[PDB]
Amino acid sequence: DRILTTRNGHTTSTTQSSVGVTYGYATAEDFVSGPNTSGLETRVAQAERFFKTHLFDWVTSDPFGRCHLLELPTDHKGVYGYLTDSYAYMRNGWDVEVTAVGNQFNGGCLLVAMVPELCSIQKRELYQLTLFPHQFINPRTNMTAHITVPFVGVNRYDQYKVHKPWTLVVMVVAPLTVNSEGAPQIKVYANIAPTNVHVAGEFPSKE
Amino acid sequence: SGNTGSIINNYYMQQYQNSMDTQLGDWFSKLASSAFSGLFGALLA
Amino acid sequence: SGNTGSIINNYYMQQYQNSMDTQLGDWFSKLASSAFSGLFGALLA
Amino acid sequence: TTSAGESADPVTATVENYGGETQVQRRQHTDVSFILDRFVKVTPKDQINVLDLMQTPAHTLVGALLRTATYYFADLEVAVKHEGNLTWVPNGAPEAALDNTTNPTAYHKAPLTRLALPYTAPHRVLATVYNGESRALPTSFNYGAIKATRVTELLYRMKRAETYCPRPLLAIHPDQARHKQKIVAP
Amino acid sequence: TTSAGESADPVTATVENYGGETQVQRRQHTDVSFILDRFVKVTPKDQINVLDLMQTPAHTLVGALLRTATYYFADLEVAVKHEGNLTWVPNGAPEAALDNTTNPTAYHKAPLTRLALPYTAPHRVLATVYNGESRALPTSFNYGAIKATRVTELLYRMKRAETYCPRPLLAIHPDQARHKQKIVAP
Amino acid sequence: GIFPVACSDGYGGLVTTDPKTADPAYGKVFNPPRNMLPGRFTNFLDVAEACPTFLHFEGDVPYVTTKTDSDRVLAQFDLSLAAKHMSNTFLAGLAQYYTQYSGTINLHFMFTGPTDAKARYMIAYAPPGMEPPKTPEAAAHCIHAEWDTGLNSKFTFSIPYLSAADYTYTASDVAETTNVQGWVCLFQITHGKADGDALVVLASAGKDFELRLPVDARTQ
Amino acid sequence: GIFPVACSDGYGGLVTTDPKTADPAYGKVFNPPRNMLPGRFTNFLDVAEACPTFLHFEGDVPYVTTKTDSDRVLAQFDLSLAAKHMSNTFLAGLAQYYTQYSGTINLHFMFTGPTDAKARYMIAYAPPGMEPPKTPEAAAHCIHAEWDTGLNSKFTFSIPYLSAADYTYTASDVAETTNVQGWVCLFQITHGKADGDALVVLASAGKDFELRLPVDARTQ
């Protein structure tokens, strides 16, 4: 009864322990045809695929609130990051997918959250990270969390060299409790993908 | 409508009072109304 | 109509408010709307 | 858009010529009747002030934007902060008729007294420039004169404004690559 | 209600699950357009004050409750007690245009002068936080600036307020078993 | 003549919350379009009802640890929105700006233990009037509920709103130190090999939770 | 009794841009007739769109001279209405009295050489974010356009309005010296016996150019 294998473009991602995809803040995209671009935008369909990245190593000595904040977009050394140095104005959504593979005998949990415009946080502020598009990961139930968000922003197209709208945040809510039969150290990976990018305005070539 | 309490019409029209909004061509009320309730298994009385 | 913002009618009639204009018996909006556009020769795609 | 380069008919090579489309454009803030009917300060004399609109300065907004027109028609309403009593006089009366109170005085009501004046000129349309006597304007190009004991600050605005025959409008000359001034910021 | 503990879809185990029933609940006092359009005090400078809404303090009601939103749209009306004349200036004009009186001044009428300003920002929606330059907000996130001889107390309120993308809201930390403060009593 | 009025006395002062709108000064402003922009909320309760936020326990942690001894009280906190345990919750974030409330408060209980550790718990509501119960035998006579840890690992228990008056104060009294609105107690009844394992708790606004009478009592 | 009112506080001060009209004092004035009088304009953009006005180059001249060397940059000026090249234009005359604009800016390019001198040119729009291009090879990757001098001697290229925000400031910032709205570059690619010959340029308001929020920042 379960369709649990996502794909974006020509790359797939099958997980067998998906509790469900959480659509944050919208189920559909905004009007991409703005009046601040005079109709000179175009969709690049070849930017929609996953790209893997490493986040941290959740070990047993990590207390509450060992958070990790990577700003999206990060250094993409493929097709998507070519558009950052070749087009000035661009917009996109994201559909992140973090993995924390241990086994079903570890304990603890780590919250995953896509949060816009995130800087200067407190550890007393971490108690209310649930407000954002979030999805828990505990090894007793699942291994992945699959969050999808649209383009938010102050204005319709963005300059990603001077601005980073989203921030993938993973923090640890309960510490990793290994047992006699669990896994000692788990490593948190993530494959991130854009959704329906739209560039506008060609830079001159660097030559 | 806000924190207005007047039944009379405004004196200044609509565009010397506010800034007019422009269409081009909500969420958490739909999110809080799709909340699951009841139980998960076969209940008794 | 100007920089008025009142939906009510004026108190003073029309002739104790302004100076009445008299008929006897515009351009740059017609000039800017007759502007040529498109191309001059046979275009391609 | 390639054109006939000297016929001086209007051509607008729009942004659709290299792909794309145009948006809906609104021009209410550049209307000539909307941009001119707001108050502007002029310097007053002590008692007698002819209500000419070309004594508005050339650096202000609706003084430098009134001189865009060659011919203008506009009803004037003034707002003057004074002490004493302020008698308005129509166009072309003798200046000894400023003292008489049968002319439309406004008694002092604190702080200022604003009042709407009609177009009293004999001409069909006034003008901003005139080569008749080589100041260099006729004595008929005025809305009249106001006389008080001591006017302090009198303000003009011109409504139902019609303009004709545009003239050049000048912005100030940068000495740098671009005229960078200190814009407002938190 | 037993649930899927990690899917993060909303679940509301109501009070009918162990007998009973729910009552009609009214939420007018927690509406985002009702709770934000009331006056709040900010500290003024002497003359020039940019009308940014993020200079409201973090301890007050609609300053700590405006920071609940990431993105907000609201028309501002101010109420300022001053002496002299107070010129409002729109977004992004040079700050030398505060002295000119063609900009919308309000003459001194005792005791204070309240006036309704439009949303003059270029952006579709303003924001309360922005990671662009590492204060830490663009110069475009303002409703403009007001300049008087000496402002004494200027008050903000924000109406037709739309908010987007909520942020965490913090109450102060008790050191006791419960934060007991002296409530009002006869 | 002119229309006579009477400039009435006592009226017309500046009130900071009045429905009088100020006179405009600068018209004809058309905003950039904002329609169908993502993530809009209308009322602050819908954020508080659709998004649960953690609690606060001893050691600045949201989770409560299972207890391998004869004492079976996991947590026992008084029921107020100015409590110590409820302090970092978003629900008590906006209830710091009001005076009184009514309605249910959902508590969400997620168990984060391994697949071999099993336990069962209970949560009871002790209404005010006598001392709160210290054993799960004594707390069986409250409006309680039990659940055990299995496949679905989350439990949501809606705290009933029992009161004499129709609305109860969201600010616990400064001098009066008995907390006469109520206690809520959660225990463990047993656990199998669940030592050192956690139970992260959350709180949300209920289905019929609504606040009332906003004030500004300076953000503690 | 009489009709009671409340003389409200905060309202009624003199605002210089208000839609309140002053009370009359002297009525029954009939103007001389003015109907169908020639040369009337209604909005200031229609004068700015139907009448193009020259630019400003080095030497106080509107024309740009062809270059008989290896360097092929005729002109390279930043795109703002407070620029140095745009200064004597009527379009930047009335854009000195506003704060922000949007829309296209037409540039008109008339070639004034003899019938034996032939040349071809290009004009490109470099959006902000990196350095503007200095060669027509590097500027081929912009939103550019080329034309050569033949029978019709005038070329009109509409500058696109690309921006993040919906409206851009017509006043370049005093402290911020990067000019993050954009550059516009025009080159020559080749010329045949066109030494010492000119290319007079012009600027007009576009089809969808509209200004916004008038101020009075004293006529520089």
PDB file of N, CA and C in Angstrom, chain E residues 5 43 66 91-92 105 110 137 144-145 161-162 175 182:
ATOM      1  N   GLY E   5       4.837   8.333  15.431  1.00  0.00           N
ATOM      2  CA  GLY E   5       5.452   9.331  16.286  1.00  0.00           C
ATOM      3  C   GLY E   5       6.390  10.299  15.597  1.00  0.00           C
ATOM      4  N   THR E  43      11.885  53.991  21.584  1.00  0.00           N
ATOM      5  CA  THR E  43      12.695  55.131  21.986  1.00  0.00           C
ATOM      6  C   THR E  43      13.078  55.954  20.760  1.00  0.00           C
ATOM      7  N   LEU E  66       5.719  40.560  16.889  1.00  0.00           N
ATOM      8  CA  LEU E  66       6.070  40.764  15.492  1.00  0.00           C
ATOM      9  C   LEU E  66       7.239  39.884  15.086  1.00  0.00           C
ATOM     10  N   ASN E  91      10.370  55.711   1.283  1.00  0.00           N
ATOM     11  CA  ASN E  91      11.474  54.762   1.304  1.00  0.00           C
ATOM     12  C   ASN E  91      12.496  55.108   0.231  1.00  0.00           C
ATOM     13  N   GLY E  92      13.754  55.221   0.632  1.00  0.00           N
ATOM     14  CA  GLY E  92      14.836  55.330  -0.315  1.00  0.00           C
ATOM     15  C   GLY E  92      15.075  56.697  -0.894  1.00  0.00           C
ATOM     16  N   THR E 105       4.944  67.269   5.589  1.00  0.00           N
ATOM     17  CA  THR E 105       5.101  67.729   6.960  1.00  0.00           C
ATOM     18  C   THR E 105       3.768  67.696   7.679  1.00  0.00           C
ATOM     19  N   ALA E 110      -1.361  70.747  19.098  1.00  0.00           N
ATOM     20  CA  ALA E 110      -1.136  70.211  20.429  1.00  0.00           C
ATOM     21  C   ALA E 110      -2.121  69.085  20.732  1.00  0.00           C
ATOM     22  N   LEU E 137      20.364  43.990   8.545  1.00  0.00           N
ATOM     23  CA  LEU E 137      19.163  44.138   7.741  1.00  0.00           C
ATOM     24  C   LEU E 137      19.478  45.100   6.611  1.00  0.00           C
ATOM     25  N   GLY E 144      10.394  54.518   5.874  1.00  0.00           N
ATOM     26  CA  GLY E 144      10.842  55.869   5.668  1.00  0.00           C
ATOM     27  C   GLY E 144      11.390  56.484   6.937  1.00  0.00           C
ATOM     28  N   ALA E 145      11.503  57.806   6.918  1.00  0.00           N
ATOM     29  CA  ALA E 145      12.114  58.498   8.039  1.00  0.00           C
ATOM     30  C   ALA E 145      11.332  59.758   8.348  1.00  0.00           C
ATOM     31  N   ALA E 161      -2.277  43.754   9.012  1.00  0.00           N
ATOM     32  CA  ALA E 161      -1.042  42.999   9.151  1.00  0.00           C
ATOM     33  C   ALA E 161      -1.214  41.571   8.665  1.00  0.00           C
ATOM     34  N   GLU E 162      -0.349  41.163   7.750  1.00  0.00           N
ATOM     35  CA  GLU E 162      -0.264  39.792   7.282  1.00  0.00           C
ATOM     36  C   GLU E 162       1.078  39.245   7.721  1.00  0.00           C
ATOM     37  N   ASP E 175      12.892  30.738  37.877  1.00  0.00           N
ATOM     38  CA  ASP E 175      13.869  30.075  38.729  1.00  0.00           C
ATOM     39  C   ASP E 175      13.222  29.308  39.868  1.00  0.00           C
ATOM     40  N   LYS E 182       3.428  39.287  41.183  1.00  0.00           N
ATOM     41  CA  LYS E 182       2.370  39.926  41.955  1.00  0.00           C
ATOM     42  C   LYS E 182       1.253  40.350  41.013  1.00  0.00           C
TER      43      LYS E 182
END
